[PDB]
């Protein structure tokens, strides 16, 4: 029983944000929303956002983050990445002042700069 403009997967409600922001922006703005940005824990979550994203070639903020590389990647909560789901790609060795954030495009995921503009997709629970 998703609200009014959300996609319903599992346990979850998703929503494509309708502005193109910072992370940290991005992050407010599911915050905003009783939300948070999205957290993929397996392999179903992984294809059903891909398929969600129905080919679009911008790119989309999820809520992984580190500050440099000498970090491991966390969820906003503070959880791990979960090893067999996704190679992350891009800027992974650079050390930026805001810190490194991932996000999809064309399916697959990519590190950069957290100040630089994006999608983002929220989620929360149905």
């Known amino acids: ?14 929503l494509f944000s309708s502005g193109s922001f910072n992370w940290e922006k991005s992050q407010e703005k599911c915050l905003s929303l009783d939300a948070k940005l999205l957290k993929i824990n397996s392999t179903a979550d992984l294809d059903f956002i891909q398929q969600a994203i129905s080919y679009s070639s911008f790119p989309f903020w999820m809520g992984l983050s580190r500050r440099n590389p000498s970090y ?8 791990p990445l979960m090893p067999h789901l996704f190679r992350v790609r891009g800027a992974v060795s650079q050390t930026y002042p805001s810190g490194t954030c991932a996000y999809i495009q064309r399916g697959a995921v990519y590190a950069e700069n957290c100040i630089l503009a994006a999608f983002s997709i929220c989620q929360k629970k149905a």
């Open 1 to 14: 029983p998703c609200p009014q403009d959300w996609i319903a997967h599992g346990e979850n409600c998703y």
């Open 72 to 79: 491991p990647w966390l969820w906003e909560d503070g959880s």
